[PDB]
Nucleic acid binder design. Structure first.
Lengths: 326, 78, 326, 326, 287
RNA sequence: GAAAUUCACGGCGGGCUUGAUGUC
C-alpha cells in the first residue's frame, strides 16, 4: 500500500536572485544609489606548464620542448575600479511558502501523506534553528564566495521591504561571525525569525540585500563563469567566459543557492570540518565525495522510503526536509 | 561487464564515455549516468589506444569529452 | 440508423493567443506602452546528481563514481530585469462563434442532429455558469501558470476593443480570488456575460489582456519550453530550449489553452481537490491519471454514443460539450 | 598510506593588481592626484626583413625580391606625453592569508598533513627573509620591468591604508638598490615586516603603491601587449596589440606577479647570475631553460612526494613553499 | 659547439624621441619658450623648431633573450672586444659628424636659410651639456674634423658605454622662409580608406601638433655606414640587417656577399675575422 | 481537424607574448 511515485517534483521554495557587482568606497557606504557597476575586462596570458606529466610511457625530451614552449590563451578576467574599495551585492532572494506543496502527484494519497509529514516537521518540529542555519550560517557571508578571503570589513545589511517601502532592516558584520559554527545572536534571530515569518506562509518576503566587502583597491575577483562546450571552436581564445548581466558582473544563482544550502552538520562522517550543502546524495562538487552514500541509509531517496512507511529519522529529518526545500 | 573508470568528469549531458573493459577488447559505452539507456559504443584495443586517440581529438579539456562523444555516437562498430 | 462518423472534426472555438513577457514596475502599472521585453539569456551550470538509480544488479564502483562528479550542462535561463518588479502579459484570446458548427461531415444527418443538440445545450441550457467557469475559474490567473506562486499582487485587466478603440474594460485581482472554487462576483459576471456575448454568435470579441504580476525583482520564471528530439546531437549542451517570440519570452498557446480549459468539477472520483482540464478521456498530463476511464461511461467518445441516440447525460453535458469547445 | 591527490588546487595568495601608466614631472612628484593617463597610440611602420631565411631548399631569386620590398605594418605603441618626465604606477597588490589553505581536497588527511607542514614552515620556519625576498628583491623595481633601463630616479613609495585612511607609509629609491642581491635595510624591514603582518593572518593589507620613474621626456615604453590569435584576419595591420585599461596603458598582472615571484637563488645550476621566478618546474619563459629538470629531484611536483612522507628538504623548502604561495 | 640561437633579441640602445614642429622667427631664435605649434607654416614665423630629446642607453650588447647563456657570454666578450679593444670615437663621430648635419630634419633640409642645431643636454631640469652648430656649414656626404663636434661625440662616448645617463634635449631651427609647406610625417590607409576615402595622406599628430615620428628619425642617426659593399662616397646608407634602403629598393650586402648581419656572428662568433667592418656589424646591434 | 515536457541542479585554479623597424 502507498507505493512510491514514478514521478515526483517539488518546487524550489526559498529561491534566490542574481548578484550586482558594483563598486563604492567605505564610509561612503550608506550612499548606495549610483554605485558604478563593473564589466569583465579581458586579459591575455602566456601559459607555463604546471600540469603533472604522465609517467606510464613517456619521454624526458618532450618536457624540455613543451616546457620551453608557450601554449598561450586569453582569459576574460574582471578587475575592480580604480579608487572604489567597497564591493557591492544587491541580491534580493525571496522565500516561497508551503514547503512540501508539490508540483506533481503520481499518487494523491502519497501527496496527502507528505503534506501530513510537512505538518509534522512544521507544526511538530519548528524552524527556529533551521532558519538559524539559513541566517547564522549564511549571514556569515558564504554568500560572497571567493571574495570572502581577507575582507577588510564584510558589512551585511539584509534589508527587506513590504513594497517600495523598506521596513525589514538589520545590520551585520560577517567578519564578526564564524564560518564553521553558528552562535546565538539576537539580531540574527530577528532575521531568522523573519524567515520564520517567510517560509511557513505568513508574509511574502523578498530580501533586498546590500552586502559590502570593503576590501581593497583595484584587485581582481572570483566572479561567476561560463562554459566552452561548442563555443571553443569559433572563439578558441577566451577560455573562461564570465557571465554578465546588463553591463555588469554576475555571480549567478547557481553558486548562490549553495550559499544558503551549505547548512547540514548532519553529515555521516565528519564533525565540525565540513558544512556541506544539503542535497540529494549530499555530494559536494569540490571534493568529489559522497557523504550519505548508497551503503549508508542516509539517502534523500531513502528518507521517504523509510519515513513514508516507518516514521523514524529522529532529527536527521532536518537534512531530509531541506532536501525538499529545493 | 568488468567495469573500470571514466574519462575525466563526464556529463554536461548526463552522459559519459564510461569506459569498461571487454575480455579481449574494451568497451567505451557512451551511456547515461542515469537509467542505463545507452547509445552506440566502440570496441577496440587497450588504454594505450584509448588515451591515444582520446588525446588525439580536438577540443580543450571538456571539448575532448564532447568531440569524443559525437565521435563514438555516429559509430561504425556494431 | 444514424451510425457514428468514420471522420469527425470540430473547430477550436474560443482559441487563444501568445504571451508577452515584458517587465515593468508597480504604481507605474498603468503606463504599459514601452514595457521592455525579456530574452532567455543562457547560463552555464555545473551540478551534482540528485537522481535515483536502478538498484538491482550494478557494480558499486559505478555509483560511487557517479555521484561524485560534475554533470555540468549550460542552461538557457530566463531572468527578470534589474529594477522592474511587475511582469506583463498581453494575451489577446478571441472567441469563435457557432459552437458545434463542424468542419467535416461523414453524415450530414448526424451533423443536423448535433446542431440540434447545440440548440439544446445552447437554447435550452445556458452558458452563464459555463462562462463563469471560463472567467471565475480563469480570472484567478491560472493563466500565468508557474509564476502564480507567491505573487505580490496579481492584477488582471481583461480589456476588450471593438477596433483599435477599446471599450470592453474591467479590472481584477487574481490573488483576491480562489483557485479551487468559483464565487459570485458582479464584474466577473460582466466579463462572463461578455463571453456570453461572444461564444453564441453575437459580437466578435478578441480580449486584449493585460495581466501584471507585481512580484519581485530580478527573479527567474517558468516560461514555456521546447524539445530535444533530433536537436540534442548538434547542440548537446542546452537541454531546455525556451521558445521565443521576436526577441521575447513565450508562454505558448498550448499551455495557455488549458488555463481556460481547466474547469470541470464534473470529474468522476474527486470533489474539490481537482479542477482538471476538460478533455477527451479527461487526462491530466501531470498526474498521469485517467479520470473518466473506459470502464466508466463518462467518455467524450461515448457521450454522443449515448446522447446522439438516447438523450440522457443530465448536466454532465457541460463537460461533454466543452469537450467540443475544442 | 596517504597517497597523492588526483586533484589539487591552491589559491594564489599575495596576488596583485593592474598598473596605471600616467605621467607627471619630478619635483611635482608629491602632487599625484590628476596625473594625466597615457593612451597607446598606433604607430604605423614600414620595415625591412631582419628575419633570417630558412636556408634548406630555396631559390635565391626569392629573397632578393623579399628584402627589396616592404612588409609594412601598424603597431600600436605607446608614447610619453610632451612635458611630463615622471611616470606613474598605482599598483595596489593585496596579500591573502592562510598560505596552504587549499581549495580542493582529494584527501582531507593529506590536507591536514599539508596544513601541518604549513605550521612547520610557518611556525618553525619564519618569513623574515621570505618577505625580504618579496621586498628587498622587489622594491628594487623589477616591478617596472622594461622601463627600468636607465631610470633617472626610480622613486618607490609603497604606501598602505587601513581604509580610505592611509597609514602604512614608506619611501624608497629602487635605483639605490641592487637587482642581483638583497641587502640589509631598516625600512625595507619595515615593509617586509609589514608583509609579515600580512601573509600569516594578522591584518588585511592591500598596498596602494606609487612608483615613479623620473626618466625623460616624450620617449616610448615597454607596456603590456596582447595576441594575434584569430584577430590577425580581420585586422592584419596592427601586429602588437597593447592591452588597455579604461583610456589608459596597462602593465597587466601576469607580467607583474613574476616581479614578485622572481626571488629564488635556490636554483640548481647558477649562483648569482639568475634571480629566476620561483615556479613549478622553475621555467623562465625568456631563456627557455628548465632549472629543476625532471632529472634533478628539485621538482615542485616532487617536494611533497618527498616531504609529505619523508620530511627532508632542508631550506630549499622556501622555493618549495613559494611554489604554493601561487 | 656553441650553436646559434633559435631566439635572439637586442634592445634598441640609443633610441630617440618625437619631433616638435613649432614656428618662430630668426633673431628671435633664443626665445624658444612659447613657440607656437603647427597643426602649412604660419604667417610670419620663419624659423622652424625641433625639440627632439633622444636618449642613449648603456650596455651595448646586453641582450633581452638568451637561447644559450654561453652564447650571451661570448657576445658580451665581443662587446668588450669592440668596446675596450675598438673605440667609439669615430663611431660617435658618425653619430654626430654625420648627424649634426641635420639629416635629422629630413625633407625640410632642402634649401634651408640657416639650419641652426643646438644639441643641448641636461643633468636634470638643470641644463649643462650645451653646444651650438650650423648644419648648413657641414657636409652631408663626408665627415670632417671639428672640435665641438668632438665635444658632442665625446659626450656620446660618455653616454653609450655606461658612464652618465644622457638624454639630449635638442633645439634644431630651420630659419628657412615664410608660410611654406613641409614634409611632415605621414600615416597609412589600410582599413581606414573605406570610412574616409577622401583624405589619402594622413599626417600623424602629437597633441595639437605636427609629428616627425621616431621611425623616420632613427634612420637619421642610423644613416652612417660607408662600409657598404658597392659604392664609395655616393651612399651614406642606414646601417641595418641586410642593409636595405627603403627608397632605392636595393640590397647592399646581399646574401651572395658575406657581408650579412645574420652572418657576421656566424663568422665572428666562431672565427673572429671581420676587420673594421665590425663597426657596421656592431651598429647592427646598436638597434 | 485539435495536445502544457518537467522541476533543478557551484563549472575553477594558475600563467612575464616580446624584440626593431622610413610610407609609396
Amino acid at each position: 500500500e502507498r507505493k512510491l511515485d514514478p514521478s515526483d517534483a517539488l518546487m524550489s521554495a526559498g529561491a534566490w536572485a542574481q548578484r550586482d557587482a558594483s563598486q563604492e568606497w567605505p564610509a561612503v557606504t550608506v550612499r548606495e544609489k549610483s554605485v558604478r557597476g563593473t564589466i569583465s575586462n579581458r586579459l591575455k596570458t602566456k601559459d607555463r606548464d604546471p600540469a603533472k606529466l604522465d609517467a606510464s610511457i613517456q619521454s624526458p625530451n618532450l618536457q624540455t620542448v613543451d616546457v620551453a614552449n608557450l601554449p598561450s590563451d586569453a582569459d576574460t578576467l574582471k578587475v575592480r575600479f580604480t579608487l572604489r574599495v567597497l564591493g557591492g551585492a544587491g541580491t534580493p532572494s525571496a522565500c516561497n511558502d508551503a514547503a512540501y506543496r508539490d508540483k506533481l502527484l503520481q499518487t494523491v494519497a502519497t501527496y496527502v501523506n507528505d503534506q501530513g509529514f510537512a505538518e509534522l516537521a512544521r507544526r511538530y518540529a519548528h524552524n527556529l534553528a533551521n532558519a538559524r542555519f539559513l541566517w547564522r550560517n549564511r549571514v556569515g557571508a558564504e554568500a560572497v564566495e571567493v571574495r570572502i578571503n581577507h575582507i577588510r570589513q564584510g558589512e551585511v545589511a539584509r534589508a527587506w521591504r513590504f513594497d517600495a517601502l523598506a521596513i525589514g532592516l538589520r545590520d551585520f558584520k560577517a567578519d564578526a561571525e564564524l564560518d564553521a559554527l553558528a552562535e546565538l545572536i539576537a539580531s540574527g534571530l530577528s532575521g531568522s525569525g523573519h524567515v520564520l515569518l517567510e517560509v511557513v506562509a505568513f508574509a511574502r518576503i523578498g530580501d533586498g540585500q546590500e552586502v559590502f566587502p570593503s576590501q581593497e583597491l583595484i584587485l581582481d575577483k572570483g566572479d561567476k563563469k561560463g562554459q566552452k562546450s561548442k563555443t571553443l571552436y569559433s572563439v578558441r581564445d577566451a577560455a573562461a567566459i564570465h557571465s554578465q548581466k546588463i553591463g555588469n558582473a554576475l555571480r549567478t544563482i547557481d553558486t548562490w543557492y549553495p550559499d544558503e544550502d551549505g547548512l547540514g552538520p548532519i553529515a555521516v562522517e565528519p564533525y565540525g570540518s565540513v558544512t556541506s550543502q544539503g542535497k540529494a546524495y549530499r555530494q559536494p562538487k569540490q571534493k568529489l565525495d559522497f557523504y550519505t552514500l548508497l551503503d549508508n541509509w542516509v539517502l534523500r531517496d531513502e528518507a521517504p522510503a523509510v519515513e513514508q512507511q516507518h516514521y523514524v529519522i529522529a532529527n536527521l529529518i532536518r537534512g531530509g526536509v531541506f532536501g525538499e526545500a529545493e | 561487464m568488468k567495469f573500470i573508470k571514466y574519462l575525466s568528469t563526464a556529463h554536461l549531458n548526463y552522459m559519459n564515455i564510461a569506459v569498461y573493459e571487454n575480455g579481449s577488447k574494451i568497451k567505451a559505452r557512451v551511456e547515461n549516468v542515469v537509467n542505463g539507456k545507452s547509445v552506440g559504443a566502440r570496441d577496440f584495443d587497450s588504454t594505450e589506444q584509448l588515451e591515444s586517440w582520446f588525446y588525439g581529438l580536438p577540443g580543450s579539456g571538456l571539448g575532448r569529452i564532447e568531440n569524443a562523444m559525437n565521435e563514438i555516437s555516429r559509430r561504425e562498430n556494431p
